Structure formats: C-alpha cells, structure tokens
Design a protein around this motif. Structure first.
Motif, PDB file in Angstrom:
ATOM      1  N   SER A 127       0.866  -1.127  -0.256  1.00 30.93           N
ATOM      2  CA  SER A 127      -0.431   0.328  -0.336  1.00 30.93           C
ATOM      3  C   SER A 127       0.516   0.994   0.077  1.00 30.93           C
ATOM      4  CB  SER A 127      -0.918   0.143   1.214  1.00 30.93           C
ATOM      5  OG  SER A 127      -0.043   1.052   2.493  1.00 30.93           O
ATOM      6  N   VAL A 128       2.002   1.373   1.018  1.00 29.73           N
ATOM      7  CA  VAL A 128       2.706   2.200   1.028  1.00 29.73           C
ATOM      8  C   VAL A 128       3.117   2.695  -0.688  1.00 29.73           C
ATOM      9  CG1 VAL A 128       5.216   1.022   0.398  1.00 29.73           C
ATOM     10  CG2 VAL A 128       4.739   3.611   1.877  1.00 29.73           C
ATOM     11  N   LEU A 129       3.494   2.270  -1.612  1.00 33.96           N
ATOM     12  CA  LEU A 129       3.921   2.281  -2.838  1.00 33.96           C
ATOM     13  C   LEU A 129       2.612   2.598  -3.450  1.00 33.96           C
ATOM     14  CD1 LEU A 129       5.933  -0.405  -3.712  1.00 33.96           C
ATOM     15  CD2 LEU A 129       6.491   0.916  -2.930  1.00 33.96           C
ATOM     16  N   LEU A 130       1.418   2.853  -3.776  1.00 28.35           N
ATOM     17  CA  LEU A 130       0.453   3.505  -4.248  1.00 28.35           C
ATOM     18  C   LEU A 130       0.289   5.008  -3.939  1.00 28.35           C
ATOM     19  CD1 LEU A 130      -2.789   0.812  -3.426  1.00 28.35           C
ATOM     20  CD2 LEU A 130      -0.792   0.891  -5.270  1.00 28.35           C
ATOM     21  N   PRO A 131      -0.330   4.965  -5.051  1.00 25.54           N
ATOM     22  CA  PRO A 131      -0.295   6.706  -5.562  1.00 25.54           C
ATOM     23  C   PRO A 131      -1.224   7.799  -4.142  1.00 25.54           C
ATOM     24  CG  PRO A 131      -2.025   5.930  -6.971  1.00 25.54           C
ATOM     25  CD  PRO A 131      -0.972   5.077  -6.385  1.00 25.54           C
ATOM     26  N   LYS A 132      -0.029   8.732  -4.075  1.00 24.91           N
ATOM     27  CA  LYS A 132      -0.961   9.598  -2.665  1.00 24.91           C
ATOM     28  C   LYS A 132      -2.262   9.589  -2.728  1.00 24.91           C
ATOM     29  CE  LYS A 132       3.503  10.779  -2.189  1.00 24.91           C
ATOM     30  NZ  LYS A 132       4.871  12.253  -1.551  1.00 24.91           N
ATOM     31  N   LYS A 133      -3.423   9.771  -3.530  1.00 27.10           N
ATOM     32  CA  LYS A 133      -4.583  10.852  -4.284  1.00 27.10           C
ATOM     33  C   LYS A 133      -4.931  11.573  -2.849  1.00 27.10           C
ATOM     34  CE  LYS A 133      -5.822   5.328  -5.339  1.00 27.10           C
ATOM     35  NZ  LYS A 133      -5.911   4.514  -4.886  1.00 27.10           N
TER      36      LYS A 133
END
Lengths: 98, 106, 79, 93, 93, 106, 79, 98
Positions: free
Chosen positions: F100-106
């Motif tokens: 999850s830490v790699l997913l776009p900040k959004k």
DNA sequence: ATCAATATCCACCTGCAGATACTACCAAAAGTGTATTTGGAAACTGCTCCATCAAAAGGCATGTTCAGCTGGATTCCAGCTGAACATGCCTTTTGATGGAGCAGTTTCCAAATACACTTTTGGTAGTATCTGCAGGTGGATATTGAT
DNA sequence: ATCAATATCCACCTGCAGATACTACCAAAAGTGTATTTGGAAACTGCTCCATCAAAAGGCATGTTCAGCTGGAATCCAGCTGAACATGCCTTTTGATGGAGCAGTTTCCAAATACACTTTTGGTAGTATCTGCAGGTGGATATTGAT
C-alpha cells in the motif's frame, strides 16, 4: 553519586551474556509454561526432566538467534532500539509468517 | 581374527556402521565397501571438530572440552558452521559479537 | 497465565546474548507471543510422538524428534 | 543396552589432543553429531540409489552423498579418507 | 514403462468438476504433487516406526504421519477420509 | 476379482501405493490397511486442490485448469499454502499484491 | 560476459513481479551476483547426480533432485 | 506532448507482470549462463531442453520472491527504493549469507 | 471543474496447437489360493524416576525515580532514477540434417545373501579413589565519567 | 590531563561433582567358512532428442535527454527507556517418599511374507478428429494529468 551513562551497562551486559552459556530464563517458571501449553493439548501428561530442559535449550537458542535478526532489522532502519516491527519483519523474511 | 576396522586402518567401528546401515532400511542391499567408506568419513569429521574444539579449550586455559568449546570450534569454522547451520548445540552459547554502530564514541 | 513467568529481565538477558543494546517497551509482550507460538508448535509435535508410542510421559527424544521435524535439530539429549 | 560412539570419539580425541579430556555433556553432543551425519549421509545415499533404480548401496553412493552433503574442503578431505580406507580394506584378507 | 498418477487424478477431477479439463503441464504439476505428498507421508511413517523400534508400517503410522504433516483442517479431513477407506475395506469380501 | 481400490471405495490405485511403499524401503513390512489409508489421503488432497483450482479457472472465464489456476488455488488457501510453503509451481506466477505504501498518494 | 547477458530490463521485470516500484542503479549488479551463486549451488548438485549416473547430459530430474535437496522443490518437471 | 509521472508506469508494470506467468529472462542468454557455469564442474556436458527450463523456472521464482523480501526491507527503512543493502539483509536473515 | 492523450476493457472472431476419442498389442502389475513364518499385542511385573511435600535463603524480580539521548517529526535540495525516444544489435523461430548418447537387452561373474559356529567385545552393575575447575577472596589494574 | 568511583583481571585456593580406575559378568556383536543366488557392469546399438546451421523478422535492449521526486543530511525536542535503589518474594537447593508407568521376559495367534497360477490393466503407439482459447480488431470508457 556515581552513575554510568545509558548504554554503558547494556554493553557490559552484552559482553557478559555472550561470554556465558547458562540458561537465561528461570527454570521453574519455564517448566510451568511448558506444562500449561502441553495440558491445553492433552491432559494427564508427564515430562522427563530432560524433556523440559531440551525444550528450554531449544527455546532460548531460538529466541537469541531471533533477537540477532531483529537487531539487524533495527540497525537497517538507522535505529539501535529493537521494536515489534523489527521482530515481525525478521519472522516474515524467515518464512515464519508470510 | 582381525576386525574390519583393523583391516581398514580405522578407529571407528566398521562392523557397527554396516549393521546400522542394514537396520536403517536405506536399501535392500549394503555393499561391503559402504560401511568402510562411511566409518572413515565419520571418523574424519569427529577428528576435525575435536581438533578445533581442543584448540578452543586451550585458548580458554582449559584441559577439558565442554559444549561451549564445541560451539566455538563450529561457529568459528566456515565449513563446519555450514554443515551444522540448522543445528543447536546445547549449552554452547553464541560467539562474542557486537554490531559496530552500537559501540560508543567515534 | 504462566507466560508472564517469562519476565522482562529474562527477555532483556536473551536480547543481550543476541547482541541487543536498546529495547522498546512493547518488545516484552511481542516476545512472549513469539515464544508461545514456538512452544505450541514443538510441544504439539512432541506430544503427538508421545501418544503414538502410547505413553503418558513426554521424553527428551520426543522433543528431539519434534525439533528435528521443524528443522531445529538439537544436539545433547540423546539427539 | 544402549550404544554410543563414546569409546571411539575418545580414541580419536587422544590422537589429536593427547592431554585433553572431554566432559560427558560434550561427549553427548559428539555422539549426536556422529548419529546426525550418519543419517544425513545414509539418507542421500539411499535416495541416490533409488533415483538410479539401484537396490544396493556401495561405497560409490556413499561417496556422492558425501560430495552432496559436505561443503567444499570437508568433502575433498572426507572423500580421501574414505577412498583410502576402502582401497586399504580391499587389499587385505 | 513410465508410471504416472495422471489417470486417477483425471478421474478425481471429474467428480469435483465434471466439465473442467486440465492442461498437460497442469497434470504434470499434480503428478509432482501426489509424488511429493506420498514421499513426505511415507518418510514420516518410516521414522515413526524406526523410533518405536517397529518393523511394520501400519495405517496407524500413516495416520500419525498425516497428523504431523498436514495443517489443522486438512489433517482433520485427511484422517476422516483415511479411517473411512480402511473401514469400508475391512467390510467387503 | 474386485480391486482393493474398489473395495475401499477409491479412485486412487491401492495396489500401486502398496508396491510403492515396499520398494521405497520405508520399513521391512507394510500392513494391509496402510496403502488403503494412504491412497485415500492422497485422493482427498487431490480433490481439495482440483476443486479450488477448478473454481479459480471458473473465476477466470476458463474451462481448462492450467498451472496459473493451481497457483492461485494454493496461494489463496491458508492450509494448502503452508503445506506447499516450500514448493515452486512452474508457470504459476504470483498473486497480485502491491504494498500500500507504493500506491499513489491521491 | 554471460552473466552480463542477464539484462537490466529482465532484472527490472523480475523486480516488478516482486512488487518493486523504484530500483537503485546498483541493484542490477547485486542481482546478477545473487543469481550466479544460486545457479552454481543448484547446478553443482545437478551435475553431481549426472556424474553419479555416468551420463554426459544433465536431465530435468537431475535438476529437480538438486532443487529438492536445497529445499526448493519444483513441481512440473517429472516427479 | 504527453508524459506519465515517475512511478505511474512502474506501478502499471507491477500490475502487468503479477498477472502473467511467462519467464522474464531471455532464454538463449540464460541458456548460455547455465552452460558456462556447468562447464566449471564438468566439461563437455549436454543439457536436456527440460533441464534448462527447470533451472529457469526455479531461478526466476527465487529471484522474484527475494525481490519481495528486499522490498519489505526497503519499506522497513522508510524507503520505496530497493538497494543492495536491502538484498543483503534479506539474504542474511534467510540464512543464505551469514 | 474542464478536457486531451492513453491505457484498459469487453464483445466477438478465427486458426490451431494441444486435448481427445477409437483400436490394438502386451508386459508388468494386481488379485487369488496356500503353506509357513513371525512381529508385536497380552499379560505380569521389576524398578526407574516423575510428582510432590518441606524448610531455609538469598538471588533476583518488581516498582519507582530521574534525566540522558534516541526516535520521530519536519524541512530543504542535490542528483538519482523514471519516462520517453531514436537506434540497431541479436534473440527467437523452425526446418532439417547429422550424430551424441540415453535407453533397451543379452551376458555372465564378482559380490551379496543366507546359514552354521566360534570367538570377541562394548555396555553394564558394583564399588572406590583421583582431579579439573567452579567459586570465594584479596588486592593490583583498567575503564568510565565528572571536571 | 587529573581524579575518583567501579568494574575487571587474576593469582591463590579449596571443595566436590564429575571424571576415572577396575574387576566381573555376558548377550549381542563380529568374524570365519561355505554353498547359493543375483545385481549390475560390460559390450552392442537402435532411435530419441540435443547441438547446429541458416535467415529474414522485429522485438526488445541500449544510449541519451529532461526533470520529478525521493533519499539523505541537518534541526529540534517530548518523552521513552536505561541506570540505580529499596524492598522482599519466590526460585533454587537439599532430600526423602509413594508409586505411576516405563520397560524387561515370556506366551502365542492374527497378519505378513514367499510362491505359483490366472487374470486384469495402464502405458506405449498409431491414426484421425475435435476444441478451448490465444491473439487480433473494434469501439467504449476509465484513468491519468495538464490547466
């Protein structure tokens, strides 16, 4: 009043325990823990004393080696203080809980 | 009547090893050369560890090899350490070793 | 509740042998949790060996066989 | 009566360290070591014979098992002692 | 002659999913799987008998072996299936 | 003559499993119920995996079970995944999983 | 060189399947080195099985047996 | 002139490669590596086609899983970029190094 | 919030590699009947050693106080690593021929197994007397930390 | 650097648990000698499949440019965690007691091995047809990202 700085005694303790081979967990308390866990699996069990000692020698060797891997995870994170996430990362990589 | 160990020039019991092989059900047949070869290897290895353990015992001013001496000899030897990488020696302790970053000052 | 017999000082001591200098306060409960899982797994197997042999007494060998099963071979107790 | 390699471990001890003794706990560890290596070697030998549809375990299978089980240098030396003992044993009786 | 569990696997496949095929590579994977589990189970029963100084591998060693090797539920059910097949077998001319 | 597999009500070959126990040198003797029990255990495990692999093939709009499906069935199942914890399934791939830490900040 | 034949894009694709998002420039050489220790360990054992059976051809089984004793069982190539 | 931000295509790659099972290393280059390494243990060796492919499935499955562990070590260190020390730590804890 | 550029997806299509249905041959395999052997459950019980009670004690755990310094939060910015291209080296396909050598089959004998005997020995039970070193003591030396 | 509190080293020493010395007994181990059975090395070789070309294809790797954004360096500070101290509990120790239950010796039949004969089968081979789905084309629309 004399007082050693924080970390000095801890280092003294490391050299001390890495130099000796005696068990570090109290005997009787470890024995009751083994009897409690076994009992939850099967009642009326008896233990040869050497079976209790074989378990304590394996358990301590496993924990010491575990703390070594944990120390390495803490250090990897620029820390000198081990934390639960270090133990958890060491066990995940070890394959003890993918 | 010379012992098979004698015939082989070995200290380890060739007749015992041949017997343990048969009893272990490793195969239907055990050739006569098998136990000789195996007893030799076993002897060589116990010699290798006793050599190193006796050294650790002297380095600690001791005359009697105890478990800690067996652990020191094994973990300090690259190959014995690997051969026994998944083995725990009761009352052996560990090798003195403190990560650099933990040492004081600079 | 014997897991609490595995005291803070006993855990610090094990950590020192493992070369640890500083310990977070939450480490003691984490360690008890880990020890317990380790013992449950080894005792479970050791006891399975006991029952199979129809004994009521867990032997050093049962433990030694249970340990080898887990890849934790132990030297010193007849194994 | 329970067997042990003690008397043999002891003989080898005096060859390498004449004035050194060994505590019983240490002898117990040495005995566990010999038994362990014996099983691991015999086990590899066993599978080696089966993979090849052989029903006999000869010094040859023991040799390959030793090469499979021991790290570089211990193997080379172990193989020598073994071959040397087989050769010698073969030229006797 | 090259033996394989392929046919008995195929048979079991139809009872579970009558309209589902399986690829050759998939069949090869399954065959590898039955072989592996056979060897792990047989090997443990082997040690079991040896430890207790027994010459015979009965269904009792197979059961303990299964208990030692399989995870919780898989073991519960495998034991159930096992006891069941030996029970049905005993009751049949 | 009714086969032993038929008697015990099984698809897996009880005769083959018997012959295999004997020729593997697991013990000097092999009881009669042993190959039956074992054959049934092998069968059950085969059913358990094919059932799950079958569902995975369904869930992918396919009718033919391929390696991918056996992998998904195995790795998505707590028990089987442990049982096969040290097994590599050729052409199986891995489970879709992004920290999850790699997913776009959004 | 051959180890250099294992390219950066391939190492990247491998890391991607491993869920890796950003890769340091030094990773490629680190990886090649790890891949090599791996294959040497496995091949060493595979070849040892080839020589024991007196063959000049490494078979799939040889590799499969080599992987199994290294604790890396591989399904799909016979046995 | 369109242009995707750094990380967007990599994330897209992760999703694409975790869906498929194909080998990611080129076959012939891999085959050359294998034969070269084998040449050092025994000269003039032949390889069954399936042997090489077995060697390739095992190697890739091994590198991929190691990359997962490495990734966890980078993340533990509060980074999203894997470095050599992340691989070393993962191998050290796995028992492949020290 | 608007909106252009791309990627992603879903519906449908077709060619074909790989799954599949039929026939036939056959050796290894699986079942079946029978005489013979035997592993190991039973029953009885000698005897080890496990569970448990007891009393004394001081080693060591627990809980608190205090403040040193580590971890966590934050901010700044150099430059590394990702994206997007233009280029072109070489992997991949696949047809096909030699021929290495894996794999099948006949031989035949060194070596293994089964059996019968005798001789040797390692493990044990009973006693008995050394000895390496754990642990206490005193004091000289070395390490740490405030100034 | 000096200086004082403390830890650490070690020579000296003695108590004793543990190692060692020995005579005794002895069932199991181990070796000698035959007669008998056979596993698998050895040589010949058919045919499976591995190494090798040849060769347009074009996929995919490599070199280059640009800048987004991540890693690592530097700052600060609240408060966690270490060190020290007092208090006193509960583990460790010494030890004898009853007896559960592990283990030794004997009796013996339910179930396994060893054959022999008959029968059933799964694997190898052809030879021929069938089909799930990979890969290609559309058009839709979700996603990403500049404004």
């Amino acid at each position: 009043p004399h007082r050693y700085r924080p970390g000095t005694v801890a280092l003294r303790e490391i050299r001390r325990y890495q130099k000796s081979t005696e068990l570090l967990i109290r005997k009787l308390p470890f024995q009751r823990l083994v009897r409690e866990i076994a009992q939850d699996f099967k009642t009326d069990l008896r233990f040869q004393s050497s079976a209790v000692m074989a378990l304590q020698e394996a358990s301590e060797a496993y924990l010491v080696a575990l703390f070594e891997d944990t120390n390495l995870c803490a250090i990897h994170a620029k820390r000198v203080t081990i934390m639960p996430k270090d133990i958890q990362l060491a066990r995940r990589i070890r394959g003890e809980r993918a | 009547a010379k012992t098979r160990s004698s015939r082989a020039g070995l200290q380890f019991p060739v007749g015992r090893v041949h017997r343990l092989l048969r009893k272990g059900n490793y195969a239907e047949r055990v050739g006569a050369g098998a136990p000789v070869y195996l007893a030799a290897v076993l002897e060589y290895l116990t010699a290798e560890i006793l050599e190193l353990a006796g050294n650790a015992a002297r380095d600690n001013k001791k005359t009697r090899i105890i478990p800690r001496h067996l652990q020191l000899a094994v973990r300090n030897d690259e190959e014995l350490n690997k051969l026994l990488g998944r083995v725990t020696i009761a009352q052996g302790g560990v090798l003195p070793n403190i990560q650099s970053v933990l040492l004081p000052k600079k | 509740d014997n897991i609490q017999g595995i005291t803070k000082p006993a855990i610090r001591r094990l950590a020192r042998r493992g070369g640890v200098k500083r310990i977070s306060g939450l480490i003691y409960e984490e360690t008890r949790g880990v020890l317990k899982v380790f013992l449950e797994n080894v005792i479970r197997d050791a006891v399975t060996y006991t029952e199979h042999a129809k004994r009521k007494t867990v032997t050093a060998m049962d433990v030694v066989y249970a340990l080898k099963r887990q890849g934790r071979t132990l030297y010193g107790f007849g194994g | 009566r329970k067997e042990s390699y003690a008397i043999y471990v002891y003989k080898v001890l005096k060859q390498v360290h004449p004035d050194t003794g060994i505590s019983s706990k240490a002898m117990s560890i040495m005995n566990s070591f010999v038994n362990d290596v014996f099983e691991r070697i015999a086990g590899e030998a066993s599978r080696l014979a089966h993979y090849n549809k052989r029903s006999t375990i000869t010094s040859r299978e023991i040799q390959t098992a030793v090469r499979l089980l021991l790290p570089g240098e211990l193997a080379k030396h172990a193989v020598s002692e073994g071959t040397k003992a087989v050769t010698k044993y073969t030229s006797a009786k």
